[PDB]
Design a protein around this ligand. Sequence first.
Ligand SMILES: Nc1ccn([C@@H]2O[C@H](COP(=O)(O)OP(=O)(O)O)[C@@H](O)[C@H]2O)c(=O)n1
Ligand SMILES: [Mg+2]
Ligand code: NI
Length: 745
Amino acid sequence: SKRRFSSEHPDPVETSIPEQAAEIAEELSKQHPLPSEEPLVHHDAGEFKGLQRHHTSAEEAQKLEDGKINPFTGREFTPKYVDILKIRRELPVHAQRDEFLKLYQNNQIMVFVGETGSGKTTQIPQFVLFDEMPHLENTQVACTQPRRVAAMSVAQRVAEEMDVKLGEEVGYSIRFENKTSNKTILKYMTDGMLLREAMEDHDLSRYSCIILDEAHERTLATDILMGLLKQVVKRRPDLKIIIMSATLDAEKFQRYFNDAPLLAVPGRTYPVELYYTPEFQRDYLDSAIRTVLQIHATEEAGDILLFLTGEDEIEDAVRKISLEGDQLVREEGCGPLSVYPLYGSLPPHQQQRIFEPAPESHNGRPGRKVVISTNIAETSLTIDGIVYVVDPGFSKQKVYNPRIRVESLLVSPISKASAQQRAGRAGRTRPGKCFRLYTEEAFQKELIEQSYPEILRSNLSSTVLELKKLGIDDLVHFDFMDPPAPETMMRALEELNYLACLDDEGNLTPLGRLASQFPLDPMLAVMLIGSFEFQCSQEILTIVAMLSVPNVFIRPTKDKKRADDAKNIFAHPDGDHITLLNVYHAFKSDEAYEYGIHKWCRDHYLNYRSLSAADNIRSQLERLMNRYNLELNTTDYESPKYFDNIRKALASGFFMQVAKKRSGGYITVKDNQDVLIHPSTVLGHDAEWVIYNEFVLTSKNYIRTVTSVRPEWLIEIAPAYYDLSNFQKGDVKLSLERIKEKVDR
Ligand SMILES: Nc1ccn([C@@H]2O[C@H](COP(=O)(O)OP(=O)(O)O)[C@@H](O)[C@H]2O)c(=O)n1
Ligand SMILES: [Mg+2]
Ligand code: NI
């Protein structure tokens, strides 16, 4: 039965200021509807006309590959393309090309498996390109990666293998980063971005083929896509699906996909000699740095791959190994050593540096390359020439606390499966070694078998809003390969209801529809959309962007005081959200430009990469707001309302993340949890009530990135949530009781 709404228990949708803005912006759009997406263009000079769709063979394709003229363009192949072509034809998948094609042609859905390095991601989409000829039938081919870096990098690679401009025929699409055009045939993308394209077009009519790659990682977006496409095939007989996975046990995938056929590529990997440590290593970084240097000194030629858990850690490791590395060249006469980082946030031109050849030695002692990388180097891509792996046995993983309902990112021990995959990378070129910084005992006993799929480790808030935009009604019976606890799904509906993205009946509100057009956490989108109603859109727009990137402040452990002093320039007391607005404003100042920008960031102890990212994110966000008719406005700084309005917008999205100061530490509105402010910030005596961006649990529980807020404002902005009937007795409800009555006449 329909829920009743009163002044005592209002409708969260009607009381949502963001909802108002959405309704306003929605109508502005109806005065000028948007044009339909720009069409695709291609080239036919008749190069393919000798080929018949879904009847093609490997030989028929070779002749075209071996022809003068690039069939997809009409221009002629470059001499480097021919060199590359010989190399890539030595990959294992090329032996099975006709076997693969025969399955592609006779089936809608198929499973593909092979060791990392078999040539799945780079080749198979090109195989499909020749048999499908999607540009002739006015379609594309999509290939999804769980990882940003894997998508961008491999797209750069395959563009060269097809001898085409990046962004023209071969292109890539990432969140806030897009290289594509009307010319694009083969599009490598993150599984998240394909999911978003599906939200706008449910049938994905632009793609005659969809390749879900690296399924074994079983990321949240991949699992959803598998669920969708399993339906789409019914509406679309003209669509073909390929599921690629690195694990040879795919039987579960076959059943889920309705007993689809399996193609397996046999392992070509060489033997890898495993080395363990005699006892537990408490500090693995120094253990790792030493192992690398040991190898470079004592071992025969070949390149080293080091697995670490994050950028700051990796950049720190690049520093030390570069330093001690240069010392051995000078002191001990070692061969030269090159050192490259790899992690998620890296720019593309920095990404591609890992493939550079090892330096040539003049000392008669081998020159070498060491790549310090995250789990990206586990299955997602391969670096030619790696004979040596160093495995500290840690990765940055998402954990979930269903009781508290909180997502945390923590460095934690890897699965046994991951350890095997890491070691396997040393045996590609020839026999090689893998040095594990744990004990053979720990590897068998302590490490777990496999990591649970992300769907089980996530809060489903964004997942739910995505599903509803896709037209899914019953979210419990949705076809997930591994269903989440239904309790988690029900919580997400509540939260999105309070955010006024959904009504009490579960239907999308105008806010929800608009919020889904932004690639942000629902809290961030709501905050951003309703921002102009609080007359600070320009400032909130900046703050969302800053929140979309890592902490920009650099605080070396030895240099702490100077770094803190540098930060207090931008620091706003009880303003951590406002601090973010200050650095970005400082970052874009004409003053920092004259100073020189990279030097400015370094001297002020700020990270240029993070701030550069935010700048791009902000631009991409501003573009969405102009498109969907969200007004850009700002209040004069001298105004008494200036900081109030920002705090109001912030509360509008984040009102469910709030804490009140203990009378007799802090208590959180939701769940009534005792917490402490993160040491990274101190608060004055005037902040009884604060909004926090982050819940951080290490032993004791912290809230980070905090900004004070007046509890009155909470009642005004979110009256449905702060309805006292929802609260249980405690310091929190009593205090709330008193703010209510004190509103008089
Ligand atoms: N991002 C990438 C991925 C692969 N490659 C090259 O392409 C070969 C591996 O092909 P692949 O990535 O398609 O193999 P799979 O892991 O997909 O099965 C290797 O010889 C790599 O050197 C590259 O240069 N850059
Ligand atoms: Mg691959
Ligand atoms: Ni049921």
